[PDB]
């Protein structure tokens, strides 16, 4: 695919709710005509972004001409956040170059909607628990109390449980591995003999 005039962003996969970061939005032009762009982004209540270079109007970008802007933003919500960026062209602004037609298709404005991830702020740390239950033709029970909310933040708390029996995780490879021919001294003879 392609687009004669589009907008692409850059940002990491995941971020942290507390600290901020910049979001780098580039715009690219491949049509011969050289046009000033109106670029920006619509934002949600689930974070807070601010520009760095908003006051100044861009001038123009020509074929293979790419401009770029940024936005210093801090997330608020947790998980996945869609980020929306709108870019379009402008007519009757012949101040950068010779002409500026600025007449694209019905979708003349690139309106891209991109998500990202954010993890919960604070030093992530864990807690482990284990249990071996074996009803030998019968019933057994247990109870496990999970409570460590000192100086914590809501909803970072997660847990999970896993049921299995783990003798077979390595019972394949090692078992089929070591079955060998005896030879050598009595020491080596035992070495090769005993394990089997």
């Amino acid at each position: 695919a392609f687009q004669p005039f589009f907008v692409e962003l850059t940002m990491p996969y995941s971020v942290i709710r507390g600290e901020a970061f910049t979001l780098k939005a580039t715009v690219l032009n491949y049509l011969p005509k050289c046009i000033r762009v109106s670029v920006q982004l619509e934002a949600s209540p689930a974070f807070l972004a601010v520009p760095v270079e908003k006051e100044q109007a861009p001038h123009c970008i020509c074929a293979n001409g790419r401009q770029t802007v940024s936005w210093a933003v801090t997330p608020k919500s947790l998980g996945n956040v869609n980020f929306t960026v709108s870019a379009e062209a402008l007519e009757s602004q012949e101040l950068c170059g010779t002409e500026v037609p600025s007449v694209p298709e019905h979708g003349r404005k690139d309106t891209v909607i991109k998500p990202l991830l954010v993890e919960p702020e604070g030093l992530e740390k864990e807690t482990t628990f284990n249990s071996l239950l074996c009803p030998s033709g019968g019933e057994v029970s247990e109870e496990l109390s999970l409570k460590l909310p000192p100086n914590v933040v809501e909803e970072s708390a997660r847990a999970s449980v896993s049921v299995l029996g783990d003798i077979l995780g390595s019972a394949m490879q090692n078992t089929q591995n070591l079955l060998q021919m005896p030879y050598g001294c009595g020491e080596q003879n035992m070495v090769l003999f005993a394990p089997n």
């Binding site: 604070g122 740390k125 100086n151």
Partner: peptide, 11 residues
């Protein structure tokens, strides 16, 4: 179980 900490520890 997992969670995040350090809203204090400031001197």
């Amino acid at each position: 179980l997992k969670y995040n900490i350090l809203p204090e520890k400031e001197e």
